[PDB]
């Protein structure tokens, strides 16, 4: 299984999502992140795995 990411339409950062989130709004923003650690556009984009 792979990691899903979604791009914030405001800040253009990619955010990891939980597996199985197969329904998202047309536009998505950091503020909608289920993870409170990554719920603000100012939080840096997490790196990908090596």
């Amino acid at each position: 299984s792979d990691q899903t990411w979604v791009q914030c339409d405001a800040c253009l950062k990619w955010r990891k999502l939980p597996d199985g989130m197969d329904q998202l709004p047309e536009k998505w923003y950091c503020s909608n992140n289920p993870d409170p650690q990554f719920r603000n556009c100012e939080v840096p984009e997490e790196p990908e795995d090596e």
Binding site: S1, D2, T4, W5, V6, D9, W14, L24, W28, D49
Partner: peptide
């Protein structure tokens, strides 16, 4: 929304 998948070796 715009999404992508990346490899996750731990799984």
């Amino acid at each position: 929304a715009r999404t992508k998948q990346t490899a996750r070796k731990s799984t």
